[PDB]
Design a protein around this nucleic acid. Structure first.
Length: 364
RNA sequence: CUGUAUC
């Protein structure tokens, strides 16, 4: 049956609710921005703030609002824009389904419109927005595919105070921080690079100056690991983080549930001179009561044993196109570790960690 | 005596 028929029978909102109805609507929504039926349908949907909002919140309704968006002419976008704002833009972001419309907007609108949109977000409580599991997707979208001058206001938000701490320590705001970084440090082969790098640095500063608390945190540790696994100018920060926070801190961090994951990756990605000083450090100061060196402590630790298996992994992998000078250095470490493990085998075998550490040393 | 997400 006809779209025109549906419109003329007052059945337009009824269709947009039904899971079948909506599919109908989408299929034969005219692509000609100039079609008379399309003008009628667009206006019927967008005439009422209440009805339009409700469509965004709809499990099914949102799909047609989306269709309206991807095909929206400039003039259409301004109507959609007004209605979003007049119907609580924030509450749209907090909604599972109204969210997708906000997001699609961001992609498909025009600079002018997107602008007032982002102008609008800026005025929200960016903090609360970044924690919300749903709301965050909107900022994710802004960052992950709009030019960084659009959302510099957001970088200034993170750099300001300790908004950053709050965000990267939060269950959901963590992935955002990773993505923002990914975004600022990307495409060395761009003229805009110079500006993004200054924004990364002010951000990266907060991160470095809290590395220890961050690395030990249930979520934030994933950001640290991000920085350490990175390729570009991120390597410069990898080195500073390792050099300032991780070194001299290896022993205690290796025993933290979360920071031991960081330590592991630091060992995997540290350049040879930083790796050499990590090893050097790990291999001895004996603890006051029952004098134990770092190595003994780690081997028997529940989280610590994982860092050691890492060191053992690293060494042997390297012992299978490198100079005989550093190759003899790795050899030095495997041996120190090999003897120690064999010395404690009778004690180690009592543990799952023990057995794996033992097996790994006998195989090689 | 085996040790953490977000999407």
């Amino acid at each position: 049956i006809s779209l025109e028929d549906v419109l003329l029978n007052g059945q337009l909102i009824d269709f947009a609710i039904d899971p079948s109805g909506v599919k109908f609507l989408e299929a034969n929504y005219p692509l000609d921005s100039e079609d008379q039926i399309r003008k009628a349908v667009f206006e019927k949907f967008t005439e009422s703030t209440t009805l339009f909002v409700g469509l965004c919140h709809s499990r099914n309704g949102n799909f047609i609002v989306q269709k309206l968006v991807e095909l929206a002419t400039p003039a259409e976008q301004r109507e959609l824009l007004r209605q979003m704002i007049d119907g609580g833009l924030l509450a749209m972001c907090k909604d599972k389904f109204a969210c997708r419309v906000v997001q699609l907007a961001l992609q498909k609108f025009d600079h002018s419109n997107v602008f007032q949109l982002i102008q609008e977000l800026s005025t929200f409580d960016l903090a609360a927005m970044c924690t919300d599991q749903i709301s965050i997707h909107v900022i994710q979208r802004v960052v992950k595919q709009l030019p960084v001058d659009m959302w510099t206001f957001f970088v200034h938000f993170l750099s300001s105070g300790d908004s950053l701490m709050a965000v990267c320590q939060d269950k959901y705001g963590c992935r955002l921080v990773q993505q923002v970084i990914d975004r600022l440090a990307e495409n060395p082969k761009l003229p805009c690079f110079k500006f993004r790098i200054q924004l990364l640095h002010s951000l990266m500063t907060c991160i470095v100056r809290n590395c220890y608390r961050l690395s030990s945190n249930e979520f934030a540790n994933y950001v640290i690991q991000y920085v350490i696994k990175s390729s570009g100018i991120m390597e410069m920060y990898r080195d500073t983080i390792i050099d300032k926070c991780l070194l001299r801190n290896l022993l205690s961090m290796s025993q933290d549930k979360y920071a031991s994951h960081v330590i592991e990756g630091a060992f995997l990605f540290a350049p040879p001179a930083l790796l050499h000083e990590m090893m050097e450090e790990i291999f001895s100061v004996k603890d006051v009561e029952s004098n134990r060196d770092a190595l003994d402590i780690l081997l028997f630790h529940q989280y610590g044993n994982y860092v050691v298996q890492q060191m053992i992994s690293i060494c042997t992998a390297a012992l299978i196109e490198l100079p005989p000078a550093i190759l003899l250095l790795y050899s030095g470490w495997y041996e120190k570790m090999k003897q120690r493990v064999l010395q404690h085998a009778s004690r180690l075998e009592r543990f799952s960690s023990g057995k794996k550490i033992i097996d790994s040393v006998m195989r090689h």
